[PDB]
Design brief:
The protein has about 325 residues and is of the alpha+beta class. It has helices at about 15-30, 35-50, 70-80, 85-90, 95-105, 110-120, 125-130, 135-145, 145-150, 155-170, 180-185, 210-220, 260-270, 275-285, 310-315; strands spanning about 155, 175-180, 190, 195-200, 225, 235-245, 245-255, 290, 295-300, 305. The two termini are about 15 Å apart. Bound molecules: the ligand Nc1nc2c(ncn2[C@H]2C[C@H](O)[C@@H](COP(=O)(O)NP(=O)(O)OP(=O)(O)O)O2)c(=O)[nH]1 and magnesium ion (MG) (3 copies). The site of one magnesium ion has 4 residues, from β4. It binds 3 DNA strands through α2, α3, α6, β6 and α14. The PDB classes it as hydrolase/dna.
DNA sequence: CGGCTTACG
DNA sequence: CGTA
DNA sequence: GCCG
């Protein structure tokens, strides 16, 4: 079992679901307290279990596994012996964890903002609604749409959304393409949003595209919120999506990349977020190359690797290729 | 011990 | 600060 | 919290 998540296949569904879910609670709680190192270790340990070929049934099976030390092994031991880990349960029911989870789930609210509100005594969404002077326009939109945004997006929703985005993209720039990325590209059957990557086969033609796309979507009445309701290339918006007799708000992410960068953007925005983070860490620490969603840089030669495909990038990094369905770290 | 992310909005 |  |  290699130490980096990008060195092993991680399928969407696996054989250690309960154990990984417990470790991810602790990871989440570490992030609520600002402990990014502990968050990473618990995230990485959970990911190791997702990559295992069978269930962990005894402690000895944790021997030699990367990112399992005293703390994560004790968590697994208690789940194996009693079905529950007291630390995890204490976190689950704590007022701090529940409120930080509630607040950070709001679109436009991160850990710093949620922590400030918590310290001021706020605890519920209605607490926030009563203090609208505390809220950015983005957070007001996240708060008003919170109930719809907490409803999982379904794979059936995704196809209708992609068609309306493609229609607006095609008017904005004939020949531009829309590629589904994020969790649905990794095979997820539901998600918190829908992620699209847009490009054009003629390098440079994608410049200035996303303002034109957003203006067309907004004119069609499909945009409930976006940051530009000047030049921009990413939009994190809220879409109006049809439903039986009505509609629901859905988060949609749109990203534009030139075709030269498209493989790097596709790799970055397909995720998972831990997979991509580990891939960039592997690139820097093990290969001495700087990877991001725009390219792959050799700091010694001061040169960028050209890539025509994700397969190119895995090869540049000396990694076996993983299809998106195996990037569910 | 140092290290653990990234550009863009 | 937020996207996260 | 764990790795190197
Ligand atoms: N660097 C970084 N990139 C991130 C982060 N979160 C997301 N991204 C970028 C990089 C990710 O690869 C990309 C897509 O992640 P989502 O759409 O946020 N989530 P997914 O589709 O996996 O699932 P679902 O939507 O169902 O929750 O967004 C983060 O914390 N950090
Ligand atoms: Mg997504
Ligand atoms: Mg997204
Ligand atoms: Mg230390």
């Amino acid at each position: 079992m290699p130490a980096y998540a990008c060195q092993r296949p991680t399928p969407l569904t696996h054989h250690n679901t309960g154990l990984s879910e417990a470790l991810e609670i602790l990871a989440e709680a570490a992030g609520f307290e600002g402990s990014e190192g502990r968050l990473l270790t618990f995230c990485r340990a959970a990911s190791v279990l997702k990559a295992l070929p069978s269930p962990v049934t005894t402690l000895s099976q944790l021997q030699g596994l990367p990112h399992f030390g005293e703390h994560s092994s004790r968590v697994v031991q208690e789940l194996l012996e009693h079905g529950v880990c007291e630390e995890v349960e204490r976190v689950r029911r704590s007022e701090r964890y529940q409120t930080m989870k509630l607040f950070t789930q709001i679109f436009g609210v991160g850990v710093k903002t949620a922590d400030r509100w918590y310290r001021e005594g706020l605890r519920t969404l209605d607490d926030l609604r009563e203090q609208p002077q505390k809220l950015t326009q983005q957070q007001k939109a996240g708060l008003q749409h919170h109930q719809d945004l907490s409803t999982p997006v379904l794979r059936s929703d995704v196809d209708a959304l992609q068609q309306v985005v493609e229609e607006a993209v095609g008017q904005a720039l004939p020949g531009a393409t829309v590629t589904l990325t994020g969790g649905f590209r990794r095979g997820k059957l539901q998600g918190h949003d829908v992620d699209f990557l847009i490009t054009h086969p003629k390098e440079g033609q994608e410049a200035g595209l996303l303002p034109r796309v957003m203006c067309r979507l907004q004119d069609q009445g499909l945009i409930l919120y976006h940051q530009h309701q000047d030049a921009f290339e990413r939009s994190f918006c809220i879409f109006r999506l049809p439903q039986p007799g009505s509609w629901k708000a859905v988060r949609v992410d749109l990203v534009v990349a030139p075709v030269s960068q498209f493989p790097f953007a596709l790799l970055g925005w397909t995720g998972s977020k831990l997979f991509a983070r580990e891939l960039r860490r592997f690139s820097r620490k093990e290969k001495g190359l700087w990877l991001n969603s725009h390219g792959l840089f050799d700091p010694e030669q001061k040169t960028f690797f050209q890539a025509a495909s994700e397969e190119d990038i895995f090869r540049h990094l000396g990694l076996e290729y993983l299809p998106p369905e195996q990037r569910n770290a």
